[PDB]
């Protein structure tokens, strides 16, 4: 007995190794990423996070790409230099092993991931994906 | 206050529009798909569902691709003329609406989706991902 869990936690693509895809997070109220590697990496891989706004012309297409700021969590220290969120897939992460992170404070209605500059060489071997949690229609 | 919904319902890419991927479903007990189109389709597209088995050379790599049989419940009247489960995205699915579904009985350790013959040039405009549920180990 397995449940049709596509409704009630659907999942969409966010980076297939060649292109980012904005995923709409308005209809839901919780979401997270589930990274996954396809072949051994060369060094640490860093990804930027972006959030979009409803476009000025059409209200159901994403607007431009704005970068989401990052908040501390009562014990932070690293404190990324230009107060802007980023995720770093650590080196020596094998395949058949997934990692799952999530930005705390949501903003906008479309979120997106993009390979940070200087790290788009071995970023074609990662494939980020998103999964939301609970419809609020 | 959104949670790291990644762990506890992770998700992976099963069909990125150009090539398939086998996703391991041993560690979990329940799973389902979340179809999503990127551009308007031209006709009803049909995908085949495949399950793998642990390869004899290495039990952490999928073997060959077998096709999952079809299970009718009571209401089934189509029976797909083949006894081999398959999904079919109907025409008129606008590319801002997802569709969920899953097989009623898993078998093996892996699962895969690939476009059935005839609808191989429309499937380049769709995206299929798999999200699991609670981890057994």
């Amino acid at each position: 007995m397995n449940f049709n869990v596509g409704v009630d936690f659907p999942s969409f693509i966010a980076w297939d190794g060649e292109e980012s895809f904005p995923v709409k997070v308005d209809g839901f109220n919780q979401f997270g990423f589930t990274f996954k590697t396809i072949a051994a990496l060369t060094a640490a891989t860093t990804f930027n996070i972006f959030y979009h706004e409803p476009s000025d012309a059409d209200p159901c297409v994403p607007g431009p790409a704005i970068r989401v700021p990052e908040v501390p969590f009562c014990d932070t220290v690293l404190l990324s230099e230009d107060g802007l969120a980023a995720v770093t897939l650590p080196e020596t992460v094998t395949p058949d092993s997934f990692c799952a992170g999530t930005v705390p404070c949501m903003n906008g209605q479309w979120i997106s991931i993009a390979p940070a500059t200087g790290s788009e060489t071995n970023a074609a071997n990662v494939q980020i994906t998103v999964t939301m949690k609970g419809a609020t229609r | 206050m959104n949670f790291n919904v990644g762990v506890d319902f992770p998700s992976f890419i099963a069909w990125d529009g150009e090539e398939s991927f086998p996703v391991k479903v041993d560690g979990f007990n329940q799973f389902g798909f979340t179809f999503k189109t990127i551009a308007a389709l031209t006709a009803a597209t049909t995908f085949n569902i495949f399950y793998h088995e642990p390869s004899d050379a290495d039990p952490c790599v999928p073997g060959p691709a077998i096709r999952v049989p079809e299970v009718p419940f009571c209401d089934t009247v189509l029976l797909s003329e083949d006894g081999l489960a398959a999904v079919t995205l109907p025409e008129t699915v606008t590319p801002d609406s997802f569709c969920a579904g899953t097989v009623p009985c898993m078998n093996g350790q892996w699962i895969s989706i690939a476009p059935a013959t005839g609808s191989e040039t429309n499937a380049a405009n769709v995206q299929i991902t798999v999200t699991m549920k609670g981890a057994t180990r």
Partner: peptide, 28 residues
């Protein structure tokens, strides 16, 4: 500030020999 939590998917076996004390042998 995102924090990841990875975990493996497939385990590996664990084989190890069980060598025992050897045949008693006199030191002479």
């Amino acid at each position: 500030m995102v924090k990841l939590n990875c975990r493996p998917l497939c385990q590996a076996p664990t084989a190890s020999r069980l060598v025992s004390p050897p045949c008693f042998i006199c030191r002479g």
